[PDB]
Amino acid sequence: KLCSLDNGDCDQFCHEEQNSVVCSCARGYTLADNGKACIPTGPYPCGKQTLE
Amino acid sequence: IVGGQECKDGECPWQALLINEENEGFCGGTILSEFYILTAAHCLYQAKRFKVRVGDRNTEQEEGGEAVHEVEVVIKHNRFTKETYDFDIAVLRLKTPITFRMNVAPACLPERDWAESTLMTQKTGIVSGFGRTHEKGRQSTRLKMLEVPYVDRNSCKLSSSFIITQNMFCAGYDTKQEDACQGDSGGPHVTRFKDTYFVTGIVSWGEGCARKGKYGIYTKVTAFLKWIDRSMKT
Numbered sequence: 001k002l003c004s005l006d007n008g009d010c011d012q013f014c015h016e017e018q019n020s021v022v023c024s025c026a027r028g029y030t031l032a033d034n035g036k037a038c039i040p041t042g043p044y045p046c047g048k049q050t051l052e
Numbered sequence: 053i054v055g056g057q058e059c060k061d062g063e064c065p066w067q068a069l070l071i072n073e074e075n076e077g078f079c080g081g082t083i084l085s086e087f088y089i090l091t092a093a094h095c096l097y098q099a100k101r102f103k104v105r106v107g108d109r110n111t112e113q114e115e116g117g118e119a120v121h122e123v124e125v126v127i128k129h130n131r132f133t134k135e136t137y138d139f140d141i142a143v144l145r146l147k148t149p150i151t152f153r154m155n156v157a158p159a160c161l162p163e164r165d166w167a168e169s170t171l172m173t174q175k176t177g178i179v180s181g182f183g184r185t186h187e188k189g190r191q192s193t194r195l196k197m198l199e200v201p202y203v204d205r206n207s208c209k210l211s212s213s214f215i216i217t218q219n220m221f222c223a224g225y226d227t228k229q230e231d232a233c234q235g236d237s238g239g240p241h242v243t244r245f246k247d248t249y250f251v252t253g254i255v256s257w258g259e260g261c262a263r264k265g266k267y268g269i270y271t272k273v274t275a276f277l278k279w280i281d282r283s284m285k286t
């Protein structure tokens with residue numbers, strides 16, 4: 001199932017390489033140590049509402 | 053936008069408004085980065101000289117959060133034509149960088165394969181703008197948004213009196229009379245995934261507004277990601 005199973009548990013982009021899940025992020029985000037979450041590099045990262 | 057709800061504080065920070073010499077908005081755009089705005093090519097015929105306003109939700113007054121930017125470069129797709137409305141896309145480079153703040157932030161550009169497999173297969177996206185709130189009427193002074201279902205490509209083509217190209221997609225309702233309208237053109241269609249909003253469409257055209265059996269037609273952003281990337285460097 002990989003990418004087709006809940007987006008491979010990725011926060012954002014999911015790719016399948018060698019029958020395994022590889023996660024990645026939009027510009028302005030860095031891939032977390034767990035290889036799944038995407039962490040903003042500054043305030044106002046793309047795609048986030050400004051509600052607080 | 054016909055129907056829908058107001059964009060409340062911070063809800064639609066990637067909305068841009070193209071304004072003419074009279075300082076009135078005539079089309080939308082989507083903020084892509086501090087220097088770049090995404091919009092529709094057909095909007096470029098709507099004003100000789102125009103600027104871009106960001107951070108506005110109410111055109112009636114200044115709040116202090118609004119900012120106006122001059123356009124340095126207009127990059128219109130060379131294949132756009134009003135004969136087909138195909139390739140309805142343009143990128144604007146601004147003379148000065150946008151300051152991000154409450155109500156001003158970029159939307160994310162997705163990757164092509166993932167966007168098509170994961171974003172465009174979701175139930176709904178969100179369209180927003182200052183366009184007319186009834187098919188006959190003036191532009192809205194308030195920024196509005198509307199959740200719109202993605203529409204099956206087959207049902208899309210059968211509903212349209214005009215050719216839907218591979219650069220276009222449909223969203224909206226069959227019976228419920230809410231949809232985008234004139235003036236929303238060029239603005240954002242975004243799709244939420246895990247609380248992050250990716251730009252998936254550009255409001256392009258429609259047969260009337262919120263008509264039963266008709267839908268909003270959007271330029272498919274995934275069809276132009278390489279063209280967008282090239283424009284954001286040139």
Ligand SMILES: O=C1c2c(c(C(F)(F)F)nn2-c2cccc(-c3n[nH]c(=O)[nH]3)c2)CCN1c1ccc(-c2ccccc2CN2CC[C@@H](O)C2)cc1
Pocket residue numbers: 134135136137187188214215224231232233234235236237255256257258259260261262263266267268269
């Ligand atoms: O785009 C509009 C339009 C109009 C009005 C208003 F009704 F306000 F006038 N609003 N509006 C608009 C704008 C933005 C969003 C929505 C919207 N979103 N969702 C929803 O429901 N509506 C509605 C008027 C008609 N039009 C239009 C423009 C272009 C083509 C088109 C399509 C293919 C090839 C070629 C052409 C162009 N050619 C030239 C002659 C024509 O015959 C064919 C068809 C219709």
